[PDB]
Amino acid sequence: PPLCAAPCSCDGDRRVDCSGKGLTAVPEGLSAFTQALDISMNNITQLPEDAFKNFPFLEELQLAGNDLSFIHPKALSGLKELKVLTLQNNQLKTVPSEAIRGLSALQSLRLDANHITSVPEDSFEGLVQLRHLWLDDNSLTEVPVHPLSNLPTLQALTLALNKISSIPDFAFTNLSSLVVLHLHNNKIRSLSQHCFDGLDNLETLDLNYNNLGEFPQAIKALPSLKELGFHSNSISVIPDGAFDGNPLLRTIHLYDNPLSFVGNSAFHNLSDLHSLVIRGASMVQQFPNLTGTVHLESLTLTGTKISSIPNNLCQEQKMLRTLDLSYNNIRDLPSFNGCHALEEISLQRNQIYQIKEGTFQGLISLRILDLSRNLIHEIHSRAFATLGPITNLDVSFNELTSFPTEGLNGLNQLKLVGNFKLKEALAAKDFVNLRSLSVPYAYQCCAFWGCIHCTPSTGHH
Amino acid sequence: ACAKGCELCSEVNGCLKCSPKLFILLERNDIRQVGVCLPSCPPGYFDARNPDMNKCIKCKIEHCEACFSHNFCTKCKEGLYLHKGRCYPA
Ligand SMILES: *[C@@H]1O[C@H](CO)[C@@H](O[C@@H]2O[C@H](CO)[C@@H](O)[C@H](O)[C@H]2NC(C)=O)[C@H](O)[C@H]1NC(C)=O
Ligand SMILES: *[C@@H]1O[C@H](CO)[C@@H](O)[C@H](O)[C@H]1NC(C)=O
């Protein structure tokens, strides 16, 4: 270990670690050649004038966790090479604008967790290099608009975990480089038409955990958006046109909203969207228009009044791996030939009354197929003939009187319980891979017993 | 006897629940995961103030050394090119 002024440790290579040592002042006896100084988790409540006078070449300064309540206007004098400054978990109460004025090399400034309630209008002037700003977990009641206008180089900004309740037009207009913006866990109930104008480079917008009651038209001004979160809000409608401004959207988090309606074209023209999962939109009547949105890996539409699946779903979707259209009012089924990547299909809780031979023809990756809780009275004898690695088949609580075996010998799991008029018993030979079976009556387990968990138990359903 | 800042521990899995003000980090260089409590997360992780508890979440960004969030890098591995929060061989 390199010889180093107590109680610090040095690593050679100009880094000095003096964290958790109970210091109440900047340590002394350290080389002026020091490049990084870690003095976090000490007891420095005040930084006096010229506190860093013998550290002119510091590039990284860590002050997190000191209960720092006062920084002298000239404490950070001379730190012209400082790139990273960490002040989280202190007692700052207001942004120390005067003290950080001359840090013209600063790229990263952490001011989170400081009980900050106000940020002076002149804050961040001189920070001509700032890339990353953290102001989260404070008590800001509004976006600090003029201070942020000083930061055209800014790439990452979090205003999360504060008390912001509305955002006015042009609040971020100068942040031309901004790539990621975190606004989550505020009380935002209002975003005006133009609050995001200027964020032409923005790729990630996090609005989760707020009180939005209407979908924000303002995201129309974000042509670079790739990831969007507005989960855990109070939005009830995603209207037609909602994402016309964001052709690059890959990810949309919309869950935990009282979402009850979506416009038929709300999700069209999203060539990069990889997943669309909407549950409980009880007022939707028509299957969404997905033209130009044909690279979904997962499609889930649940709890709607949809009664029909368009024929082109499987001629258009290119990489659809999972499809969940359970708990709707679907009666007829189109062909799923074309959906060659399709592995899991859920169609529980609809009104399907028959399965024709062609219904499942092309499905050579199909592993899981759930058709329980429908009204199926007839399944064509060759309905599963042309299947691949079908592993799991649930046709419980339907209206079967017979059940086809062809193509099903690879099943691990088969559910047949709740078909009260299903009389035939299965032969063990047709199902040598079976490990779990449910049937409507006890005598239908006798193959698999002496008279692999075969059970006639309704499961109380 | 729990480490300082840890409300609930186990003999073999370290901390199960930290003081709400601290962040829990899972280490597994190991046989298993071992929970530890931190005031702030080390580089390679980011401080995540989640609804269930404060967590240190690992950076899983190709070629990244330190990050701002799951998809934005603040420092690339040495010799890599940093462009808009991503790291590139160039
Ligand atoms: C952390 O905080 C307390 C509360 O102030 C510290 O009080 C300091 O006591 C030392 C020794 O007497 C002085 O050098 C400081 O200047 C005191 N603070 C002030 C601003 O007057 C206490 O010592 C600290 N505890 C630890 C862990 O060192
Ligand atoms: C930022 O952009 C707006 C609108 O163009 C302009 O009016 C404002 O003065 C600019 N602010 C700075 C500090 O560049």
Residue A306's CATH number: 3.80.10.10
Dihedral-angle region of residue B33 (phi above 0 means left; psi in -120 to 50 means alpha; beta otherwise): beta
Q: Which of A24, A26, A44, A66 to mutate to test the pocket of ligand 1 (most atoms within 8 A of CB)?
A: A24
Domain hosting residue A22, numbered range? 1-449
Q: Confirm if B43 and B66 have CB atoms less than 8 A apart.
A: yes
> Which one-letter DSSP state was computed for residue A426?
P
User: How many CA atoms are closer than 13 Å to the CA of A15, on its beta-carbon side?
Assistant: 8
- The CA distance from B49 to B54, in Å, is 4
Burial (Cβ within 10 Å: 0-12, 13-18, ≥19) of residue A13: exposed
Q: Confirm if A170 and A146 have CB atoms less than 8 A apart.
A: no
Residue A11: how many other CB atoms lie within 10 Å: 12
Q: The domain that contains B40 carries what CATH number? A: 2.10.220.10
User: CA dihedral in degrees (A66, A67, A70, A73; nearest 10)?
Assistant: 30
Q: Confirm if A267 and A276 have CB atoms less than 8 A apart.
A: yes
- The CA distance from A260 to A258, in Å, is 6
Residues 6+ apart with CB under 8 A from A340: A362, A363, A364, A365
Residues 6+ apart with CB under 8 A from A420: A440
Question: If interface means Cβ-Cβ distance under 8 Å, which residues of chain B face chain A?
Answer: 39-40, 47, 49, 51, 68-69, 71-72, 74, 84-85
> Which one-letter DSSP state was computed for residue A242?
T
Residue nearest to atom 11 of ligand 1 (CA): A24
Reference A230, options A283, A199, A191; nearest CA is A191
- Is A455 domain-assigned? no
- Is A225 domain-assigned? yes
Tell me phi and psi for residue A104, to 5 degrees: -65, -10
The full DSSP string for A167-197 is: E-TTTTTT-TT--EEE--SS---EE-TTTTT
Tell me phi and psi for residue A91, to 5 degrees: -120, 40
Tell me phi and psi for residue A430, to 5 degrees: -70, -10
- Is A457 domain-assigned? no
Shortest distance between the Cα of A319 and any Cα of chain B, in A, equals: 24
- The CA distance from A324 to A159, in Å, is 36
- The CA distance from A439 to A455, in Å, is 6
User: CA dihedral in degrees (A322, A323, A324, A325; nearest 10)?
Assistant: 180
First vs last C-alpha separation in chain B: 51
- List B17's β-bridge partners, or say none: B8
Shortest distance between the Cα of A179 and any Cα of chain B, in A, equals: 7
Tell me phi and psi for residue A134, to 5 degrees: -110, 120
The full DSSP string for B26-42 is: EE-SSSS-EEEEESSPP
- Is A113 domain-assigned? yes
Q: How far is the CA of B64 from the centre of ligand 1 (A)?
A: 39
CB-CB under 8 Å, A156 with B85: yes
- The CA distance from A410 to A97, in Å, is 69
> Which one-letter DSSP state was computed for residue A431?
G
Selected residue of B37, B41, B45, B72 to mutate for chain A interface (largest A Cβ count, 10 A): B72
Secondary structure percentages of chain A, helix, strand, coil, to 5:
5, 20, 75
Tell me whether A203 touches chain B (CB under 8 Å): yes
Amino acid at A433: N
- The CA distance from A321 to A348, in Å, is 18
- What tokens appear for B57 in the block? 């979440």
Q: How far is the CA of A23 from the centre of ligand 1 (A)?
A: 9
Q: What residues of chain B lie within 8 A of the CB of A179, using their CB?
A: 72, 84-85
Q: Indicate if ligand 1 lies below 6 Å from the C-beta of A48.
A: no
CB-CB under 8 Å, B69 with A156: yes
Tell me whether A147 touches chain B (CB under 8 Å): no
Per DSSP, the three-state class of A444 is helix
- What tokens appear for A163 in the block? 């008390």
* Pairing, β B6-10 against β B14-18: antiparallel
Q: How many domains does chain B have?
A: 1
- The CA distance from A245 to A243, in Å, is 5
Residue A256: how many other CB atoms lie within 10 Å: 14
Q: Would you call the peptide bond into A7 cis, given omega within 30 degrees of 0 as the criterion?
A: yes
First vs last C-alpha separation in chain A: 69
CB-CB under 8 Å, A160 with B69: no
> Which one-letter DSSP state was computed for residue B44?
T
The full DSSP string for A283-319 is: T--S----TT----SEEEEESS------TTHHHH-SS
Tell me phi and psi for residue A298, to 5 degrees: -135, 130
How far are the Cα atoms of A107, A367, B76, B84, B87 from residue B90, in angstroms, in the given order?
A: 22, 42, 12, 14, 9
Domain hosting residue B73, numbered range? 1-90
Q: How many domains does chain A have?
A: 1
Q: Confirm if B70 and B45 have CB atoms less than 8 A apart.
A: no
Tell me whether A231 touches chain B (CB under 8 Å): no
